[PDB]
Amino acid sequence: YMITLEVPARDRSYAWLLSWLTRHSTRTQHLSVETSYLQ
């Protein structure tokens, strides 16, 4: 017995949740590289 909120791709707050998730990336065993360059 839990709660499973489902937010698919077609949502207005999709970008907001993605930004928050990038903000809260600490304590995450799986990662993706976020390197940027400035010559």
Binding stretches for a copy of itself (CB under 8 A):
1-8, 11-13, 29-33, 35, 37, 39
Of 4 and 24, CB closest to a copy of itself: 4
Min dist CB 24 to a copy of itself, Å, is: 16
Report the sign of the C-alpha dihedral through residues 28, 20, 34, 6, in that order: positive
Task: Give the whole-angstrom CA distance, residue 2 versus residue 25.
Answer: 23
Min dist CB 15 to a copy of itself, Å, is: 13
**What is the separation of C-alpha 7 from the centre of its chain, rounded to a whole number of angstroms?**
12
Min dist CB 31 to a copy of itself, Å, is: 5
